[PDB]
Amino acid sequence: MRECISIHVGQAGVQIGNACWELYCLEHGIQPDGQMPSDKTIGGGDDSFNTFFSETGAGKHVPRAVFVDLEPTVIDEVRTGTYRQLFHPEQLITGKEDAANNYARGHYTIGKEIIDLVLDRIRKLADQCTGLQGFLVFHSFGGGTGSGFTSLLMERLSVDYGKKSKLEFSIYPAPQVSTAVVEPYNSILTTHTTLEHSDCAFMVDNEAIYDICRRNLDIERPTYTNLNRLISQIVSSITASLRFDGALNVDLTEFQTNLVPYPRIHFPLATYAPVISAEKAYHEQLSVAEITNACFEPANQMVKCDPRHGKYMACCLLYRGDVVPKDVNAAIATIKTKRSIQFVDWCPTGFKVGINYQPPTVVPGGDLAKVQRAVCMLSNTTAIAEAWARLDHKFDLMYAKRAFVHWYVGEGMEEGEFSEAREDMAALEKDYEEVGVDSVE
Template identity: 80%
Template structure:
């Protein structure tokens, strides 16, 4: 039976990341920008990618995806761009008026105007599935549409599709770079409203990805395209086991099972290696041990926090390309003896088994070599790894955000913009209390074994 996955791209960040992801998926599966596949390839392909693409009557492959933004400019770029024939016009939903970086506009006023249309378009996509597995949601925490509309949509997805998995790829506010002064408000409001609806949220922040582009690729002023192409490699690695045939296939539920020890602690950070420019690729030997070690270095992680200050609860390593299980075995053994990499004492050696048991490590190997978009700054390499790590160090990012929220909320700065859109001031306090509880959850998890906990059965 097919196990289809529907991707939902919300707001500027979600749509632009979506653009980069579908560009990469098409290259990986040999699908042309108009959705057709050259006939010489059709005979020798496995059709595992139909979890992400549906085949239209015309023989065209169409992404199982929907793009939503409350204003049209970003989606218009897709409507007129290289991949304009890949998507059906009904897969693009735009409003006329943007959320103006205001969670309340995205969730209450402007968002309410398009939610029913979006739900019916999603319903149409689900009716085209024989065994829907779940949803991937792409968005930013800081924008008005990404924060407000996504949380409204997640509530409806939970109501409409019950227990279907919902995994998020979210752009988290950066420590120094900010696109809007009210990012901390939007982020904390949306984290609170989606905490019960999202099963697992993979986080990245622009500043961390920006620094990776600068230091590793030598791009002096990285653009969103640079950032998104790098982030799309992470998305590709995470979804490779869902899109390619192989004995190590995994479904969305397994990511949750392996990475989320308690329902609320569901924010793994991502790292990817090697990120290397074409000039350097010829001179560097990138063994499995090298790229594995790179993932545990703070400079390669996609959220600005220091994992050496926290403890790992679960780690998932997803390899691609020319990788031998023996080498992985050795690389992981090296990691376990590294003193600066600490695991919580209740985790079974910190790594989880799932697809193949190598020293009880959660490892995936996909023998398809990593693909790069022509003209991008990243070199084509024979092997790569993506690490997803649930670590207590991410608490540092929440603490930083809460502090910024408190500075503004103490003066009630900008609150009138939210109340003017039908929100109550009490929602701010309620969301902030929930985030304080989330910080405490991380503290407790780092300190104790979960055995005596009431939550024990969740583990």
């Protein structure tokens, strides 16, 4: 069997973890109490899989996961909420204080006194992983914790284990929308480090998912309690292959390599088919061909990045429900047939595929309507660098006057560290230029 470790660090992750684990139960027919009256009904099946959940002789089941956010006010909601009787209570409410958007705190000063636990529960959880192991981490770039603690953590994990899949899911800081004014300092510092230990980090954004939440979901006033569910389903649509059967399954490690040409471009995007409200549950057939067009629609991308200002290095597509490979070859054919899409000359192959029979599910009280099938896309593209360009510009503008710097230094971060991380990011920016330029002879 295969297993994986879901970690949530900071606010954003945890709000997503609540969303994520809420879905998994439903997909597995498990009740909040860890029990299976559905198994009382069925009396069989491994639906409470070892992949994400453990089990006991009481009929309880426990997810393979953990969280920490240095904000007791968040977890406590969970600890008193509907799922308190589910999780292992040893959740790391260490929030004597928060990092307050300061990397130096969450990374160095007060990431101390905490991490030695975070690693330990991981081991206890790891020791039960008589299967594959690949990690799933949820953080937000720009936030103090989601960048500070995450950077510290993965560094050690690459040393405790190293030889493992360590895939992040994370919200990039938007170009315009922001809930803070020092995310840029915080983000760049992050990529200085996690670039090196990690192996992939799917990036998303709130602005786009907001826009999607408007246009197709027909929502006037969306909020966090809906975005997370879109972010959740993806993570399921990824991880399903480990759980159910499929005419064409896939491992985590397969994503590690087919999407990752060189060690330093392991930073792709994602889409889905959340284009379906209850009313427009009709008026469409929602085919394989139908959606596969939609996956590469600029609008339905999950970050603010025109593909058309760049090219596609590699893409992977994971389908669900009643989906036939024949259609996939057909729809994917047409996608190659269009010139709005520009690939490299490197990749005649271009595309990887994946299919699982197990359809999606739908959360009650939610938004997305039932659909007999669905698909996820990932893409490593040169286009993203414009987003990198926006950030490094912001960094330089204000850093020049050394604004907000004394706070980090007040926590022990040397000055030029910022410049060290900057020079790195320009290299990454150059790296994307390199790959993007066509070859000649």
